[PDB]
């Protein structure tokens, strides 16, 4: 079992643009240096979530065929996926990108930001659940692209055009599972499991909602 030249090209495009993004040093310094208060910790999450939306727009633009979509649907896709993309990237950073001791300081700030435990508890549970799957970078990059290119978001004029962009990504992701996990025929079903979990975070987030960044206010419709 192997990826066709077409699936390889499409995968290489997703991977390249996914690796382009990174956490700013200017943010990393705040995690280390800024005061440990509910106001200061909430301000750090605001900075991190804003940077993520900017990184999410750069990734989204480079998605094969995204630019061929109607300009209005491009906005509805960005708005519909922002929250889910944030939680998936948050899971990635938690299980990967941060040093052992720095992650503890970040967790300390996420748990002391004045956000209720009825939301903080399923959040860390979700990161832990993602961590258990031991997802490769290709899986993180494909899941993020599938999340963004969801044909079932509200206010999309041409859903069929979006279906045509997402279906090839689900085909690549399923084929990668068959190639790398042939002994785990439930691996693809587990990844789809995280996609449904991610969708509950839209409900948790709206209930979760100090005024936020313009980039956040607009992409969340608050």
């Amino acid at each position: 079992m192997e990826l066709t030249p077409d699936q390889q090209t499409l995968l290489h495009f997703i991977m390249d643009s996914y690796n382009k993004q990174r956490m700013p040093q200017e943010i990393t310094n705040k995690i280390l240096k800024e005061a440990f208060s509910a106001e200061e910790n909430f301000l750090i999450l605001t900075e991190m979530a804003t940077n993520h939306v900017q990184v999410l727009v750069e990734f989204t633009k480079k998605l094969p065929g995204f630019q061929t979509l109607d300009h209005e649907d491009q906005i509805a896709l960005l708005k519909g996926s922002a929250v889910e993309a944030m939680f998936l990237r948050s899971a990635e950073i938690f299980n990967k990108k941060l040093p052992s001791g720095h992650s503890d300081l970040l967790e300390a700030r996420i748990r002391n930001s004045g956000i209720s435990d009825e939301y903080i508890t399923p959040m860390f549970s979700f990161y832990k659940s993602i961590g258990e799957l031991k997802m490769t970078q290709e899986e993180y990059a494909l899941l993020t692209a599938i999340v963004i290119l969801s044909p079932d978001r509200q206010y999309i004029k041409d859903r069929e055009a979006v279906e045509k962009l997402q279906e090839p990504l689900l085909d690549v992701l399923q084929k990668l599972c068959k190639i790398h996990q042939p002994e785990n025929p439930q691996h693809f079903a587990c990844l789809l499991g995280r996609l449904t979990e991610l969708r509950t975070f839209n409900h948790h987030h709206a209930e979760m909602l100090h005024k936020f960044t313009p980039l956040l206010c607009e992409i969340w419709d608050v």
């Binding site: 727009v57 906005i75 708005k79 607009e218």
Partner: peptide, 11 residues
């Protein structure tokens, strides 16, 4: 509405 999102997507 969403002027900055529009700016980022088209820049």
């Amino acid at each position: 509405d969403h002027q900055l999102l529009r700016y980022l997507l088209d820049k």
